[PDB]
């Protein structure tokens, strides 16, 4: 009976384990996309600051 | 369960590898954007002068 219960628990745990491994896969995909979007955002923001201060220097 | 363990291991390895690769690609994109934007700023300075 313990083996039967353990087999049922193993089936359920492996089902949720494949589900959670997949979910972690999309989670880290979204994480990498978020960091890429960040990197791009702060890079372009620094570029905005640099170009704006260059415009100010040119005006002066 | 063994197959799920192998799937978890391979999926984690591929996730780490792909995440690293795409993170560095996004980096390189960021530096290229910054370089071309500094070039645009220099062109704007030349236009102002």
From Swiss-Prot, chain A:
Protein name, as recorded: ATP synthase subunit b
Similarity comment text for this entry: Belongs to the ATPase B chain family.
Described function: F(1)F(0) ATP synthase produces ATP from ADP in the presence of a proton or sodium gradient. F-type ATPases consist of two structural domains, F(1) containing the extramembraneous catalytic core and F(0) containing the membrane proton channel, linked together by a central stalk and a peripheral stalk. During catalysis, ATP synthesis in the catalytic domain of F(1) is coupled via a rotary mechanism of the central stalk subunits to proton translocation.
Quaternary structure annotation from Swiss-Prot or TrEMBL: F-type ATPases have 2 components, F(1) - the catalytic core - and F(0) - the membrane proton channel. F(1) has five subunits: alpha(3), beta(3), gamma(1), delta(1), epsilon(1). F(0) has three main subunits: a(1), b(2) and c(10-14). The alpha and beta chains form an alternating ring which encloses part of the gamma chain. F(1) is attached to F(0) by a central stalk formed by the gamma and epsilon chains, while a peripheral stalk is formed by the delta and b chains.
Places the protein is found: Cell membrane
Organism per entry: Mycolicibacterium smegmatis (strain ATCC 700084 / mc(2)155) (Mycobacterium smegmatis)
Coiled-coil segments on the chain, per record: none
Curated annotation (Swiss-Prot), chain B:
Protein's cellular compartments: Cell membrane
Lineage: superkingdom: Bacteria
Cystine bridges: none
Cited function: F(1)F(0) ATP synthase produces ATP from ADP in the presence of a proton or sodium gradient. F-type ATPases consist of two structural domains, F(1) containing the extramembraneous catalytic core and F(0) containing the membrane proton channel, linked together by a central stalk and a peripheral stalk. During catalysis, ATP synthesis in the catalytic domain of F(1) is coupled via a rotary mechanism of the central stalk subunits to proton translocation. This fusion protein includes a component of the F(0) channel (subunit b) and of the F(1) subunit (subunit delta). Two copies of subunit b and one of delta together form the peripheral 'stator' stalk which links F(1) to F(0).
Miscellaneous comment as given in the Swiss-Prot or TrEMBL entry: Binds 2-aminothiazole antibiotics, which are antitubercular agents.
Self-association state and partner proteins as the record states: F-type ATPases have 2 components, F(1) - the catalytic core - and F(0) - the membrane proton channel. F(1) has five subunits: alpha(3), beta(3), gamma(1), delta(1), epsilon(1). F(0) has three main subunits: a(1), b(2) and c(10-14). The alpha and beta chains form an alternating ring which encloses part of the gamma chain. F(1) is attached to F(0) by a central stalk formed by the gamma and epsilon chains, while a peripheral stalk is formed by the delta and b chains.
Family: In the N-terminal section; belongs to the ATPase B chain family.
This protein's name: ATP synthase subunit b-delta
Organism the protein comes from: Mycolicibacterium smegmatis (strain ATCC 700084 / mc(2)155)
Lineage of source species: Bacteria, Bacillati, Actinomycetota, Actinomycetes, Mycobacteriales
Shown residues in whole-protein numbering: 51 to 99 of 445
